[PDB]
């Protein structure tokens, strides 16, 4: 004739004040907690009803492609921006201000900014092989009374 | 385990040109200009002629990618004119139909 | 009798930021195949109109590419073989639609495209114009 | 005339998917999903239910092996985006030299032999290790007490010979983290005596347990000896005051070990269990259906289930009528079956779907457990409603769970034959018998 | 002799006249003949003969069945994502309206087909269009643009198209098309002296 | 005379099914194809890869279930996923033909980096259209 969770308690552990509000989560996760995650993932595991929930479960897995379809999802040139593709002039710099290594620098640079199948690193490193080239060159140009740096 | 050695050889010459292509580019495009000074293009023709000869991207060849067969290959499909027949009179290539008008 | 007592519902967060808004959606599905077509024009129409988005229908020419071949293994180069693949199309164009029910009916009907037809949907995103050019900074 | 921008509405990725699945039930002529929907492939008994489901699933492990055993077959990525779960998965360890590195990598890699023998070389060639990773070993060790981990090819059974207690001899440094993980090894493996000798040990060092040494502690002391159900209770007492005493904040696994380890006692533990419950409630620590299970079980007993274990079920069923659960236990699925036990023996049909009726709301059919708990709720759930409803309502019950929910056993099959013989509804007789075959 | 299995009768006859087909196929599934309760055939007939049964025909087993897309699943379907639209603007009423308000159109492309990999080139084209008039401009700022723009600009629709695919990504191709609409801009309303040669 | 892909008439005896018996320029005529796929649409990529996996798995599922196979596959397309549609005779037990299901799409998917499903028919026999 009584409710069970109104009675006559334990009284060890008295009302909270305040619960823990600056939470441990910054320490490293153990394997006890590791199967203790896999045993509260097992307690939901269930054979999956219908079609739709095996379409959830791949789209979660990550083997089901999102929608709306996005041709570039999962994919960023490591952040680059329009200016860092682009304008490749502030590479230039280890390059003669005029002359012609500069103008053939300039139509190699105008060529690499057109191009939109090559990463900024791959961008950077046809630049930074030409002026290795052309400082191993030095001799043969300055030959040819054209000053590299 | 390609269908012949001539398959394998274009194997072969197809990564030695992916493996070089980068410096291929490089060293004609320091030829194929006006701009720099003679003597240097004439050290980038040296150059690119000591590198080898199958990193030479003319060398490679569109053999059908099942039976190696050189020549009625379909860019589209990379199958031969015979293998592609055999699969499209099976109706296992989609869309494809016998052309009639 | 076994109906579930209670629904359960996926959530929906109504971001502070303002939606893209489409002034034209034209989803061009093409096919090998014009009941397929026919068929998903149907699905798409009644799902555009249950939605309450406006969409309009249109059949572009249809595109028969043909080419040849030798028929015979060896020699008798005066017989052939042509095979066709026909390309047919169906244009949607949605108006006026907001970026979040663009999406939802994009997803949609993606989703539930039928194999064997694909699909390249033009975006027009209105925009308006950035500071930098509304007044000259000259 | 002024234009507004409505707000951008976000969602998960797979909303919706879930907003569609929200508008198809259960086709109840269809066998589960997981079967193929083909008459001579869809499965005719539990028992070949059951096969089925184990012969694809070994299936799955064949190619798994195949895959793990040929990596070199499979390393040709052509997915966009990467799909990493569908790439073999490795298991050879990179750091092959002597260092703290190779012992975490191999530690992260559950090598149990590997791990023990870098641990070796490194005390012999005495290179540097660190307090954390030699917890982190002794957490490998002690939570599978040395015993190797099984793969698909390649009691107390805490071993008396153990290298894990051997570490702990050799380790210099020890800490909480470190006499923590070894009792909550020696508990899991039953080593009941050895947990507690170093609990006093920890106590002796001026050391704070963790909660779930607490726990590891609660379940070594109630199985340790075999006392009267008060001196289990003064104990455990004993050291939830401990727990005060060191400020540490119980959990829910706390209570749940405490009732999971008194349910023993039965009567002795039954007002007991009831202060224990309220003292979660004012706590704050809200129960889950573990906790609801495990109290179940305790009053459980043969005897009278209307003395006191109607009103336990009554509460528990008005306490959580229209709430929708959450993973918090390891033992949450059973929950449901006890429940569905307890309707059944006590004839209470209004319970029994009062039951149905909170294990439909929301994701809460998720818990209904393995398949033998399913099959055995759902036969006791159809023997009740055969024994206890209108014969009409009984039918129409008999066709949404089977073949859909489950698959009949004949002792049903012969409940709802006499049912439908007190209903002199004969004419289903044969349908039945075709059903049967 | 071991038994032989007997398959069982198909499920179709367990269903009902008024049931809820959506349940039987919530997701594209390929026909099943034991789910499908109706009698279809397919086929070229023989002489003097029939369509092949619905049991073991390839030909119905090939067709991209809609069936689970019925009008009432439709219906259902929209019903349920009505949640996740949100109204148009019902202020602009037309496109008239639309341009006199928003004056960049953005126009973008995305290519679904059937295939493991998602990625498409053409995907990272963005084409921004913008009408002169809508601008802030004047004469001379006009007429050096339009001399800059070259072909871009088409006078009979006073409409500027600048079309970015250098960039891999259409984000970069949009960010480029604002960049290169903005410094055409600013050099339109920039006056060189060497423009008094004209 | 033509020979490509056709049953040529011997006895009167010989079974066939639909597809075996119709000829090639009936193709898109009275039979469709056994694979969908949009890579052979205009402008569409990746036909030759997509007609190479094809190729495989057809080989691949041929081989796996010797003589279980009582007619081509159909092989659907839709996003990434792959779904493989089958006619199998009734001649193994069910554990053998789920063992095989689970193994083909666990190694399929595993192999080719997308979600493939398998879709069994159960026919008693060879389903015979006409008889050559």
Known sequence: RKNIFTGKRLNIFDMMAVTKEAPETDTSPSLWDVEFAKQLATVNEQPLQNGFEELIQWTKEGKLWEFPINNEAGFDDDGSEFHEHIFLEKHLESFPKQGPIRHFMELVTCGLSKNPYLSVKQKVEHIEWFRNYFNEKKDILKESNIQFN | ?101 | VDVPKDLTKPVVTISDEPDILYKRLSVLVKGHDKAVLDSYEYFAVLAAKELGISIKVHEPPRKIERFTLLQSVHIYKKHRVQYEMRTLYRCLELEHLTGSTADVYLEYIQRNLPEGVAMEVTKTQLEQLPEHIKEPIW | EEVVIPKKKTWDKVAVLQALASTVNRDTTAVPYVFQDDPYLMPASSLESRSFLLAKKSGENVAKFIINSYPKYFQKDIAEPHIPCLMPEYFEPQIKDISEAALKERIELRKVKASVDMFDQLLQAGTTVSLETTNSLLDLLCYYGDQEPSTDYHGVTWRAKNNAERIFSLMPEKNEHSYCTMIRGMVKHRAYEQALNLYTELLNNRLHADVYTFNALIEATVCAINEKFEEKWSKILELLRHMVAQKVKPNLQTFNTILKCLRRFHVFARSPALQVLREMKAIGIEPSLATYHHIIRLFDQPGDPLKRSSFIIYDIMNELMGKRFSPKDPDDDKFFQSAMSICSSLRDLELAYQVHGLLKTGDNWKFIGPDQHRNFYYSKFFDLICLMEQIDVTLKWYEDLIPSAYFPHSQTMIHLLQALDVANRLEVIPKIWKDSK | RPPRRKALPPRTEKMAVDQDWPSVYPVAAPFKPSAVPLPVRMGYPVKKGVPMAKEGNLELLKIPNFLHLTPVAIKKHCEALKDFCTEWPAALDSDEKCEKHFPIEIDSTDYVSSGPSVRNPRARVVVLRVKLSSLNLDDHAKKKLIKLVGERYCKTTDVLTIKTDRCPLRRQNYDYAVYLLTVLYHESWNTEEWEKSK | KNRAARVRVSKGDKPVTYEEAHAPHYIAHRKGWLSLHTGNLDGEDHAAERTVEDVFLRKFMWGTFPGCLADQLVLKRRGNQLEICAVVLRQLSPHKYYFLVGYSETLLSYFYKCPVRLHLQTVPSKVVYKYL
Not at chain 2, 58 to 76: A, L
Not at chain 2, 85 to 98: E, F, T, V, Y
């Open chain 2, 1 to 101: 385990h390609y269908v012949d050695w001539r398959m394998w050889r274009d194997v072969k010459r197809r990564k030695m040109a992916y493996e070089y292509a980068d410096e291929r580019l490089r060293i004609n495009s320091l030829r194929k200009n006006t701009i720099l000074p003679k003597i240097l293009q004439d050290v980038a023709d040296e150059e690119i002629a000591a590198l080898p000869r199958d990193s030479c991207p003319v060398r490679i060849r569109n053999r059908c990618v099942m039976t190696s067969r050189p020549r009625g290959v379909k860019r589209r499909w990379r199958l031969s004119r015979i293998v592609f027949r055999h699969l499209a009179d099976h109706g296992q290539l989609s869309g494809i139909q016998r052309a009639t008008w």
